[PDB]
Amino acid sequence: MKVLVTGFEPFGGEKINPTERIAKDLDGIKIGDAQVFGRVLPVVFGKAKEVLEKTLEEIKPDIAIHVGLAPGRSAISIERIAVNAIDARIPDNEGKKIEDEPIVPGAPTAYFSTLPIKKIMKKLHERGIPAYISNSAGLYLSNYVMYLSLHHSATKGYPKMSGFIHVPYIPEQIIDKIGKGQVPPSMSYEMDLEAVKVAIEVALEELL
Amino acid sequence: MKVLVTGFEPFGGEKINPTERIAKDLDGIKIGDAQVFGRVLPVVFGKAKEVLEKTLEEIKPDIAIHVGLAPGRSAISIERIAVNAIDARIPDNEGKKIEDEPIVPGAPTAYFSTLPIKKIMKKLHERGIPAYISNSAGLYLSNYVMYLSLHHSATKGYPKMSGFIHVPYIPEQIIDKIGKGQVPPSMSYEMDLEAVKVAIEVALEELL
Amino acid sequence: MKVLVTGFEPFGGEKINPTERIAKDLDGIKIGDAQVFGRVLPVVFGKAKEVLEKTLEEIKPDIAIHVGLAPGRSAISIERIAVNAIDARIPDNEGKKIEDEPIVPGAPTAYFSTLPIKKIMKKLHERGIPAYISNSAGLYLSNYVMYLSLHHSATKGYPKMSGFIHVPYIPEQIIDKIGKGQVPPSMSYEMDLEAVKVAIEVALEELL
Amino acid sequence: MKVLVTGFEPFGGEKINPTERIAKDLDGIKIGDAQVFGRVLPVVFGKAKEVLEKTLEEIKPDIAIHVGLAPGRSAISIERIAVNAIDARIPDNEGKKIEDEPIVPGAPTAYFSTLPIKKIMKKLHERGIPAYISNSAGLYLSNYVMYLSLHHSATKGYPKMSGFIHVPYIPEQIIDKIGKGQVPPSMSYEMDLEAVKVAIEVALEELL
């Protein structure tokens, strides 16, 4: 049993992206006899697809849990759906701002996450971790990778389960925001890491 | 050198108030040779004044740091001013909803906190703790105690420094909020506790 | 050329739903030689489908613009996608709270709105009307009708264009909210009405 | 009976300030036999004080209602208190960003508005105008003028009543905000103007 967890590099002017550390912290660990692989993806259209595809083909995980930062969100959010569209509010790390363009021409308009999202949310709550189901992962890189992963599952047969989890800013990222005229919500890195571990465990238990 | 830290009991239907635990956790500890006393106050007009007055007279602290819960706030907030007014949006724990009434008839319309609020905010930031200066502690029990404490200082000569710190909901308090149609910001109890300890240390260093 | 505009009846305890008036105000009007029909839909699962289906079959509009109230939103929002799922945060007007259930079993996971959403947004901006593209119409009745309308288009060939527009609370709906501990954003009814008229005109110009 | 209404010039990069038009629109009008004077103030520390002082001495109004723009607020807000402090989050129109400095050294820490704020709020509600009581007018120019006006009343005996009213962005100011990654609340200029007229009428009726 193999699990792939991905995170993203910093973007949008931020010095850090907490999901990058999550991926690195979880890489190489084992939950039961399941092997976990952690990989960081670039916040760049096209290149992110190349890396994701190569990683999926290399590892061939049974479960894929893609993690990303969601500025402004106040709790852990589990994405219910991936949409076949790109409409960036901001450009990617290479200055590309793609608007109204499909991710995969001719492919389904959307894919539902195949992770047991409701069970994951329930377990997180039991652990005192606020979490909810998000109905839009945006139309930037998070949705981009979420869709491609689910499409890979639908066309290649693996991973069996795929989904996306967004985390809020971590406290240290809020400091420079103060004075700039706003105080966005934040959540500790420790809670985020535990949340992802819980998601993996629940997904695994689901696959038996 | 003596420091008094207060917290509040649960109110507004909440099962817990994180500041109650903060007070209990800090009671009896020492920062350097300074003795810290932690006391919990009732969320009841009148009675809260009795308890506060008695506590202040009993301990005669050099520094008083009153802590409270601020539902909806996203980071640690240090109150800049206490206002001589009561206008409760909700009733206190005994069903009393006082509207447009002074706290102390004839006393000053307001008192500025005497804690080194800017230095405290700066130190918190250096510790990676998001914090900002609040210009209104509301007109409920937090402001009530903040004003009475500062008034005590002005009329009795002690405590030398007095102020108020509000903390966001802690994560576990958000669980039942989910589904109710909203996900308020939250901050870990551990961060809150450390923030209060930092405030105490900075206040002490200020008094020398 | 025929255009169908729908609105919803009051729900969630609200005395009014501004979209109900929008539908009635636009019913019978003409934009050029295009005939506009305005109909009000019940905020009830099942029944809403019956009414929508019957209305679509009766009128056979070339363009369908469904309007609804989005409590909390601050500006006009044009829905980009309809999702094949029902997961009500609150029950409908008949007390039914459907959770994790498809709208049409076996049908596509989602449909993109076929209204020229970007052009509509642009024209609204030129008119000084704040508007943006929403990537989730929720999973309540608004999404329910949006999906069914787009599904009707895909399977029956009409309407040629279908989409959904959400409007904020109108000012009068905020009054009772004040004191309840919150002041949600609002937008004038007049602006909402004009926004819908603009959307219709742009959609029509698109069909030529 | 004379009434002075003030507004502010554009600031913070905005092309307009709706309160500037409010002042000009109300200048010269009469409510009953009361004469209303409308004046625009610069968003500049020091200079704003000069203009305010000169205006107050020139007109010697019985009632002074200062109006300002509050970016982000969703409804009309009536300020309850003015604070003797300056701590600008942004610089004024001349690049001056004053931090932790009193407005009037030695003067009271704060002054309560002498306008019948609760009655004004009630009348606005009866007119279908969402409005609430604000407990902080910020520590920028709005608070600056509010405090100086109330201080003038306390030391000079006039105006008899003084207060501050903040209005949200008007819709047209939101357009350029869209895409920038946020849609702030807004309220029509017409509603703002009526709200100020209502405040004046209620204040006048209070003075008899």
Side-chain angles (χ1 to χ4, degrees):
Chain A
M1 189 64 73
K2 296 187 296 299
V3 178
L4 168 67
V5 174
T6 64
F8 280 108
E9 62 181 4
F11 72 95
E14 288 300 326
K15 280 63 173 59
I16 72 168
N17 187 321
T19 66
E20 169 165 37
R21 181 158 57 189
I22 290 177
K24 293 182 178 180
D25 277 353
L26 295 177
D27 186 38
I29 77 166
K30 292 187 59 174
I31 293 181
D33 282 298
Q35 186 59 61
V36 180
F37 300 71
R39 297 288 193 279
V40 184
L41 301 172
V43 181
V44 179
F45 293 108
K47 189 168 302 177
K49 176 177 172 59
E50 292 179 51
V51 181
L52 176 66
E53 298 297 325
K54 288 170 167 54
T55 303
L56 291 177
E57 175 172 51
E58 179 203 317
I59 301 172
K60 301 193 198 304
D62 296 286
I63 299 169
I65 294 178
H66 305 289
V67 195
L69 171 71
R73 295 196 181 180
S74 61
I76 298 300
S77 54
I78 306 161
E79 304 296 345
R80 173 183 247 120
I81 187 175
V83 182
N84 192 6
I86 302 174
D87 197 11
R89 195 200 75 185
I90 61 172
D92 65 12
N93 279 172
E94 304 201 325
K96 310 195 194 71
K97 185 178 176 183
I98 302 179
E99 302 175 302
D100 297 310
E101 183 168 301
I103 297 177
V104 179
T109 295
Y111 284 109
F112 279 137
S113 170
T114 45
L115 292 178
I117 68 178
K118 287 304 180 67
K119 290 187 179 182
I120 292 176
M121 176 173 76
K122 185 284 291 181
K123 190 65 181 296
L124 289 174
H125 290 180
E126 291 177 354
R127 297 289 266 281
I129 298 174
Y132 66 96
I133 304 303
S134 169
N135 294 138
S136 174
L139 296 177
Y140 191 51
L141 275 126
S142 293
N143 178 73
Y144 182 72
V145 294
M146 185 188 178
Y147 184 87
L148 287 166
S149 186
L150 283 165
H151 182 64
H152 195 92
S153 176
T155 63
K156 299 253 196 170
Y158 74 86
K160 305 170 190 175
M161 300 181 134
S162 181
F164 199 102
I165 293 178
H166 267 114
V167 304
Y169 280 123
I170 52 175
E172 52 190 278
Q173 293 184 287
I174 305 300
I175 306 309
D176 297 320
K177 309 290 182 175
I178 302 175
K180 291 179 178 167
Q182 182 66 325
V183 190
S186 61
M187 181 168 277
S188 77
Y189 172 74
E190 292 76 20
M191 180 165 280
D192 292 343
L193 181 63
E194 182 66 18
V196 177
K197 287 180 182 173
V198 169
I200 295 170
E201 299 171 359
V202 176
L204 286 169
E205 285 170 26
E206 198 66 2
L207 272 185
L208 302 175
Chain B
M1 188 65 73
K2 297 187 295 299
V3 177
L4 168 66
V5 174
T6 65
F8 280 107
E9 63 183 3
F11 72 95
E14 288 301 326
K15 280 63 174 59
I16 72 169
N17 187 321
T19 67
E20 169 165 38
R21 181 158 57 189
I22 291 177
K24 293 184 180 180
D25 277 353
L26 295 177
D27 186 37
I29 76 165
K30 292 187 59 174
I31 294 181
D33 280 298
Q35 186 59 60
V36 180
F37 300 71
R39 297 288 193 279
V40 185
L41 301 172
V43 180
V44 178
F45 292 108
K47 189 168 302 178
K49 176 177 171 60
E50 293 179 51
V51 181
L52 176 65
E53 298 297 326
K54 288 169 166 55
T55 303
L56 291 178
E57 176 171 51
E58 178 204 317
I59 301 173
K60 301 193 198 303
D62 295 285
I63 299 170
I65 294 178
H66 305 290
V67 194
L69 172 71
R73 296 195 181 180
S74 60
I76 298 301
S77 55
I78 308 162
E79 304 297 345
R80 172 184 247 120
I81 186 174
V83 181
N84 192 6
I86 302 174
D87 197 11
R89 196 200 75 185
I90 61 173
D92 65 12
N93 279 173
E94 304 201 325
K96 310 196 192 73
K97 185 177 175 183
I98 302 180
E99 301 176 302
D100 297 310
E101 184 168 301
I103 297 177
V104 180
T109 295
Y111 284 109
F112 279 137
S113 171
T114 46
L115 292 177
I117 67 178
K118 287 304 180 67
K119 290 187 179 182
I120 292 176
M121 175 173 75
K122 185 285 290 181
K123 190 64 182 296
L124 288 175
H125 290 181
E126 292 178 354
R127 297 288 267 281
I129 298 173
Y132 66 95
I133 304 303
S134 168
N135 294 138
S136 175
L139 296 178
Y140 191 51
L141 274 127
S142 293
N143 178 73
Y144 181 72
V145 294
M146 184 188 178
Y147 184 88
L148 286 167
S149 188
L150 283 164
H151 182 64
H152 194 91
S153 177
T155 63
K156 299 252 195 171
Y158 74 86
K160 305 170 190 175
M161 300 181 134
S162 180
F164 199 103
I165 293 177
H166 268 114
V167 303
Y169 280 123
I170 51 175
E172 52 190 277
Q173 293 184 287
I174 305 300
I175 305 309
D176 297 320
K177 309 290 182 174
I178 302 175
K180 291 179 179 167
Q182 183 65 325
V183 190
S186 60
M187 182 169 276
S188 77
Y189 172 74
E190 292 75 20
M191 180 165 281
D192 292 343
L193 182 63
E194 183 65 19
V196 177
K197 288 180 183 173
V198 169
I200 295 171
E201 299 172 359
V202 176
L204 286 169
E205 285 170 26
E206 198 66 2
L207 273 185
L208 302 175
Chain C
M1 188 65 73
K2 297 187 296 298
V3 177
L4 168 66
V5 175
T6 64
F8 280 108
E9 63 182 2
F11 72 95
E14 288 300 326
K15 280 64 174 58
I16 72 168
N17 187 320
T19 67
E20 169 165 38
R21 180 157 58 188
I22 290 176
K24 292 184 180 179
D25 277 353
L26 295 176
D27 186 38
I29 76 165
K30 292 187 60 174
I31 293 180
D33 281 298
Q35 185 59 60
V36 180
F37 300 71
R39 297 288 193 279
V40 184
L41 301 172
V43 181
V44 179
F45 293 109
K47 189 168 302 178
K49 176 176 172 59
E50 292 180 51
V51 181
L52 176 65
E53 298 297 326
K54 288 170 167 55
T55 303
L56 291 178
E57 175 171 52
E58 179 204 318
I59 302 173
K60 300 193 198 303
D62 296 285
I63 299 172
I65 294 178
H66 306 289
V67 195
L69 172 70
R73 295 196 181 178
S74 60
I76 298 300
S77 53
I78 308 161
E79 304 296 346
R80 172 183 247 120
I81 188 174
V83 181
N84 192 6
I86 302 174
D87 197 10
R89 195 201 75 185
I90 60 173
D92 64 12
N93 280 172
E94 303 201 325
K96 310 195 193 72
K97 184 179 176 183
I98 302 179
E99 302 175 303
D100 297 311
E101 184 168 301
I103 297 177
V104 180
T109 295
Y111 284 109
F112 279 136
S113 170
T114 45
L115 291 179
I117 67 179
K118 287 304 180 66
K119 290 187 180 183
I120 291 175
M121 176 173 73
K122 186 284 290 180
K123 190 64 182 296
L124 289 174
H125 290 179
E126 292 177 353
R127 297 289 266 281
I129 298 175
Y132 66 96
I133 304 303
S134 168
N135 294 139
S136 174
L139 296 178
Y140 191 51
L141 275 127
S142 292
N143 178 72
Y144 181 73
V145 295
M146 184 189 179
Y147 184 88
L148 287 167
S149 188
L150 283 164
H151 182 64
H152 195 92
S153 176
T155 63
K156 299 253 196 170
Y158 74 86
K160 305 171 190 173
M161 300 181 135
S162 180
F164 199 102
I165 294 176
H166 268 114
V167 304
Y169 280 123
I170 52 175
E172 52 190 278
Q173 293 184 288
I174 305 300
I175 305 310
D176 297 320
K177 309 290 181 174
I178 302 175
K180 292 179 178 168
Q182 182 66 325
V183 190
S186 60
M187 182 169 276
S188 77
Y189 172 74
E190 292 75 21
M191 180 165 279
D192 293 343
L193 182 63
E194 183 65 19
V196 178
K197 288 180 182 173
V198 169
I200 295 172
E201 300 172 359
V202 176
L204 286 169
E205 284 170 26
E206 199 65 4
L207 273 184
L208 302 175
Chain D
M1 188 64 73
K2 297 187 296 298
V3 177
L4 168 66
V5 175
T6 64
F8 280 107
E9 62 181 4
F11 72 95
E14 288 300 326
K15 280 63 173 59
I16 72 168
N17 188 320
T19 66
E20 169 165 39
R21 181 158 57 189
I22 290 177
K24 292 184 179 179
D25 277 353
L26 295 176
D27 186 38
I29 76 165
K30 292 187 59 175
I31 294 180
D33 281 298
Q35 186 58 61
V36 180
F37 301 72
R39 297 289 193 279
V40 184
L41 302 171
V43 181
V44 179
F45 292 109
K47 190 167 301 178
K49 176 177 171 60
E50 292 180 51
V51 181
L52 177 65
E53 298 296 326
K54 288 170 166 55
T55 303
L56 291 178
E57 175 172 52
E58 178 203 319
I59 302 173
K60 301 193 198 303
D62 296 284
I63 299 170
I65 294 179
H66 305 289
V67 195
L69 171 71
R73 296 196 181 180
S74 60
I76 298 300
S77 55
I78 307 160
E79 304 297 345
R80 173 183 246 120
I81 187 175
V83 181
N84 192 5
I86 301 173
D87 198 11
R89 196 201 75 185
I90 60 172
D92 65 13
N93 279 173
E94 304 201 324
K96 310 196 193 72
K97 184 178 176 183
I98 303 180
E99 302 176 303
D100 298 309
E101 185 168 300
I103 297 177
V104 180
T109 294
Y111 284 109
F112 279 137
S113 171
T114 46
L115 292 178
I117 68 179
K118 287 304 181 66
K119 289 187 180 182
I120 291 175
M121 175 172 75
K122 186 283 291 180
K123 190 65 182 296
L124 289 174
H125 290 180
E126 291 178 354
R127 297 289 266 281
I129 298 174
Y132 66 96
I133 304 303
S134 168
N135 293 139
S136 174
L139 296 178
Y140 191 51
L141 275 127
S142 293
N143 179 73
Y144 181 72
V145 295
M146 184 188 180
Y147 184 88
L148 286 168
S149 188
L150 283 165
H151 182 64
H152 195 91
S153 176
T155 63
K156 299 252 195 171
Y158 74 86
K160 306 170 189 174
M161 300 181 134
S162 181
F164 199 103
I165 293 177
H166 268 114
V167 304
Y169 280 123
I170 52 175
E172 52 190 278
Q173 293 183 288
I174 305 299
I175 306 309
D176 297 320
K177 309 290 182 174
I178 302 175
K180 292 179 178 167
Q182 182 66 325
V183 190
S186 60
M187 181 168 276
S188 78
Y189 172 73
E190 292 76 19
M191 180 165 280
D192 293 343
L193 183 61
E194 183 66 19
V196 177
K197 287 179 183 173
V198 168
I200 295 170
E201 299 172 359
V202 177
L204 285 169
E205 285 170 26
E206 198 65 2
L207 273 184
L208 302 175

